[PDB]
Amino acid sequence: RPDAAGHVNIAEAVQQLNHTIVNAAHELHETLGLPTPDEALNLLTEQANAFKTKIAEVTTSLKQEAEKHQGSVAEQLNAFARNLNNSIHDAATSLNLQDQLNSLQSALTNVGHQWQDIATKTQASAQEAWAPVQSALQEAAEKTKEAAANLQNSIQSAVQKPAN
């Protein structure tokens, strides 16, 4: 199909970021074995703490658009943006030697699942639906993606450093 009829664009566009977060999310469990089944949390926690606050800056970019005019329709999306601050607030806080990796994959994936919600609304409106979010999501997907690159970079750089 040609881009799925044509209304599909944000779900397909954001999908490019999903390939990144899913990679680092799976690498987090792979790096956990590199050092030990406990101390490894330090490598993930140190990196996850940067991505946790980084989303706070990216999520604000979405609600920031509602402080000019989008706020009318954005009001429903404002509930989706705040959910990210709640997911990151408790993404790297549970350090019970299991919540770090479990919360990281659920946290990094949370932004991917939450974006899927609005990515679908474009199918309903199509013309105006993406217009206001295109600037907030396109500018947030690039900033959140940059955080995933540096995040996986440590996990991939720490696992490749020793190599067997």
Swiss-Prot record:
It comes from the Eukaryota. Sequence repeats lie at residues 14-24, 25-36, 37-44, 45-62, 63-73, 74-83, 84-93, 100-111, 126-136, 137-150, 151-164. One of its GO terms (cellular component) is extracellular region. The keyword Secreted applies. Glycans are attached at N18, N85. Residues 150-164 have a biased composition (Polar residues). Keywords: Glycoprotein, Lipid transport, Repeat, Secreted, Signal, Transport. It is found in: Secreted. Residues 137-164 are annotated as: Disordered. One of its GO terms (biological process) is lipid transport. Its main location: secreted. Hemolymph. Transmembrane segments: none annotated. Assists in the loading of diacylglycerol, generated from triacylglycerol stores in the fat body through the action of adipokinetic hormone, into lipophorin, the hemolymph lipoprotein. It increases the lipid carrying capacity of lipophorin by covering the expanding hydrophobic surface resulting from diacylglycerol uptake. It thus plays a critical role in the transport of lipids during flight in several species of insects. Equilibrium between a soluble monomer and a bound lipoprotein form. Apolipophorin-3 associates with lipophorin during lipid loading until each particle contains 14 molecules of apolipophorin-3 in L.migratoria (5 molecules of apolipophorin-3a and 9 of apolipophorin-3b). Two isoforms of apolipophorin-3 (a and b) have been found and occur in a ratio of 5a:9b in the hemolymph. Belongs to the insect apolipophorin-3 family. This is Apolipophorin-3b. It comes from Locusta migratoria (Migratory locust).
